[PDB]
């Protein structure tokens, strides 16, 4: 019916601002008309059960920049209209999974900059309506469960940046994820398994992550990819035909990388001239190319070698059940694919249950079967040309 003394309302009565106060607790008489409530820059330590029980029109609850340590099970009861829940910059050490109970209209959950120690299994599963989740700046994060992101069928945005993550979490349940923010972590190598099951991904940000190498066919599974940000890393080159299966890739951020402008960047220099100016940065090496933008790098003054298959695959006589290898020592940046006798083509990205293509080009088997008999061709490609070498696998 009326505005609280420690708060400031608006003519609509939609907006209630209670910022820059010495509040240790949430105001007692918040009007039922409220759509947007601001409770930032206060000393609130605990959100008691049924606190906002009668605020049925509340769309945005701003609880950011406070001292919130505990959130009770029924703290968010009666919040049928809640779309945005901002809980960033608090003292939360555990995700309040029970508190996010009946929030059927919740689309945005900001939990960034919190002393959250662990993301347990099936957390956020009680909110399948969630579309935007920010778990950034979690400096005290020690554990992420494999089933942590389970139940989030409608999630389109995930921010897990500045969490000091050393190895990629299981993002497979996020089937409909379109935007991923992984910037500010530690990933020296980007593997094809790192982003497995992210078919719907359109935007990928892996800035300031100390990336020194991107493995062969790493982004191959990311068919829907529109935007890729790999800026501010230690990248000197990218594998041949890395962006070729990315039919929808139009926005690229490749700057602040110590690019080695030799025959290996020529495919990229062509790709950017044909599909994309201030987006990709400059050559840091060799000295003759230093300072030039990779978009302005001209192949017209380049003399290149075709793929050198230094060690062609050797013929193998092996018994059923044994592990077998077909080596293919080729320049590390070249494109490598394997043609099996059945006619199927395998890459480093392929998820075959027995036969795997390693990053060095070698074809691993784990255990051979009677059906694995015939000619296996190592197919290598560069900007200068292509090379092929076959081997016969017996039993």
């Amino acid at each position: 019916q009326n505005c609280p003394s420690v708060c400031s309302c608006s003519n609509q009565f939609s907006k209630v601002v209670c910022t820059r106060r010495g509040l240790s607790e949430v105001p007692q008489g918040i009007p039922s008309n409220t759509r947007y409530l601001n409770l930032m820059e206060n000393n609130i330590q605990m959100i008691q059960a049924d606190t906002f029980r009668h605020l049925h029109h509340l769309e945005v609850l701003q609880l950011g920049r406070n001292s919130i340590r505990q959130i009770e099970v029924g703290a968010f009861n009666g919040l049928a209209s809640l779309n945005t829940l901002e809980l960033f910059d608090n003292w939360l050490t555990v995700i309040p999974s029970g508190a996010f109970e009946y929030l059927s209209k919740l689309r945005e959950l900001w939990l960034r900059n919190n002393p959250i120690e662990s993301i347990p299994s099936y957390a956020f599963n009680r909110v399948p309506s969630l579309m935007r989740l920010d778990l950034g700046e979690l400096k005290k994060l020690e554990y992420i469960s494999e089933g942590a992101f389970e139940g989030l069928f409608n999630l389109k945005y995930l921010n897990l940046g500045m969490c000091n993550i050393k190895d990629m979490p299981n993002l497979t349940p996020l089937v409909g994820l379109e935007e991923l923010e992984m910037s500010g972590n530690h990933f020296p190598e980007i593997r094809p398994g790192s982003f497995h099951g992210l078919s719907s991904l359109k935007k990928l940000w892996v800035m300031n992550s100390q990336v020194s190498l991107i493995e062969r066919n790493a982004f191959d599974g990311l068919a829907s990819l529109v935007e890729l940000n790999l800026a501010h890393n230690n990248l000197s080159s990218l594998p041949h035909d890395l962006f070729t299966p990315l039919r929808y890739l139009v926005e690229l951020h490749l700057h602040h990388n110590p690019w080695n402008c030799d025959c290996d960047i020529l495919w990229l220099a062509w790709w950017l001239r044909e599909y994309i100016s201030t987006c990709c940065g400059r050559c840091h090496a060799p000295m003759h190319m230093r300072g030039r933008y990779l978009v302005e790098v001209d192949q017209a003054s380049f003399q290149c070698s075709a793929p050198f298959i230094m060690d062609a695959p050797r013929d193998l006589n092996i018994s059923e059940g044994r592990m077998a290898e077909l080596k293919c020592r080729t320049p590390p940046m070249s494109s490598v694919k394997w043609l099996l006798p059945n006619g199927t083509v395998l890459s480093h990205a392929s998820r075959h249950p027995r036969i795997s293509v390693l990053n060095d080009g070698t074809l691993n088997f784990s255990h051979v079967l009677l059906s694995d008999t015939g000619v296996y061709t190592c197919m290598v490609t560069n900007v200068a040309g292509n090379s092929n070498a076959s081997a016969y696998l017996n039993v």
């Binding site: 400031s8 701003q62 950034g136 940046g161 800035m207």
Partner: protein, 303 residues
């Protein structure tokens, strides 16, 4: 070192106490309309483009961000900041000039430290005036890419000999919680009594100006989809120094709206640069540090 003017009369050279110069500063924020609030604007984060929690409304005192917030005394963790409008006018540059007016010659003793909120500028200039804003000279150039912004070679004040340089050390994107400062290395420049003319004159000024040319970009190029991410926000500009009294005063106070030396040694004027009316037998001389420890007073005399 040089605090006492008179004792037992016997005179000595004197300096006023080191002040927190931001307490007595006048502000000029150009152009008109650069400060947020009219009309109200919602600000988004570079870390999360959907996190648009903060708003600037000049009508509401709790949501307002006036220029005065760059100099006020702050309580533990309760930072107050001046905020600029969003880069809604892009591709047209988001430029702002913050002028620090004192109407008095002040000598710098410590580093000029500017504290930015939610991102430092990609391109900025720090300038000084000795004639209340008539002529201007640069102190230091700040750019993410020194060659792209000013066509100057990126140099560090740390690697310097016995000069105006461009530094890249205070412009990179490192988030909203880390690397909030842009500083002018006063103590390091002095580290390289001295009777050099240009030395004391270098750290002397009436005004300071910050030519904010390009805001924080969040690590990459500008994304036209959300321009509400790009703005300026300054919580504090710490200016530390003393009044220039030509070694004729030990007190500097607010008189007629601005700071003025409490002149001793029979001298007059704002900086004690002239002989007082009845003491003009000898022409005005500025006090000297030599010989140590008291120094030569060089007082004005009567008949």
């Amino acid at each position: 070192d040089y605090d006492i003017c008179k004792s037992w009369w016997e005179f000595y050279a004197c300096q006023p106490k080191v002040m927190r110069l931001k307490d007595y500063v006048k502000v000029k924020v150009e152009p008109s309309g650069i400060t947020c609030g009219d009309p109200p604007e919602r600000f988004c984060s570079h870390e999360n483009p959907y996190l648009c929690s903060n708003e600037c409304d000049a009508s509401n005192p709790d949501l307002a961000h006036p220029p005065r917030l760059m100099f006020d005394k702050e309580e533990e963790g309760l930072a107050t900041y001046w905020q600029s409008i969003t880069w809604s006018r892009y591709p047209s540059p988001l430029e702002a000039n913050i002028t620090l007016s004192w109407n008095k010659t002040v000598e710098l003793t410590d580093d000029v430290v500017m504290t930015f909120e939610y991102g430092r500028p990609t391109v900025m200039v720090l300038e000084k005036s000795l004639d209340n804003g008539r002529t201007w000279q640069p102190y230091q150039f700040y750019a993410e890419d020194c060659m792209e912004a000013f066509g100057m070679s990126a140099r560090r004040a740390r690697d310097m000999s016995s000069r105006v340089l461009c530094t890249e050390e205070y412009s990179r994107w490192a988030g909203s919680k880390k690397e909030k400062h842009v500083r002018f290395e006063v103590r390091d420049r002095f580290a390289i009594l001295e009777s050099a003319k240009g030395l004391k004159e270098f750290f002397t000024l009436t005004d300071l100006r910050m030519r904010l040319l390009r805001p924080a970009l969040g690590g990459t190029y500008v994304q036209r989809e959300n321009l509400y991410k790009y703005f300026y926000a300054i919580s504090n500009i710490e200016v530390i120094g003393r009044c220039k009294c030509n070694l004729h005063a030990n007190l500097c106070s607010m008189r007629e709206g601005s700071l003025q030396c409490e002149c001793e040694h029979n001298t007059t004027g704002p900086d004690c640069g002239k002989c007082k009316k009845n003491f003009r037998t000898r022409s005005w001389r500025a006090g000297s540090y030599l010989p140590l420890p008291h120094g030569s007073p060089n007082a004005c005399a009567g008949t």
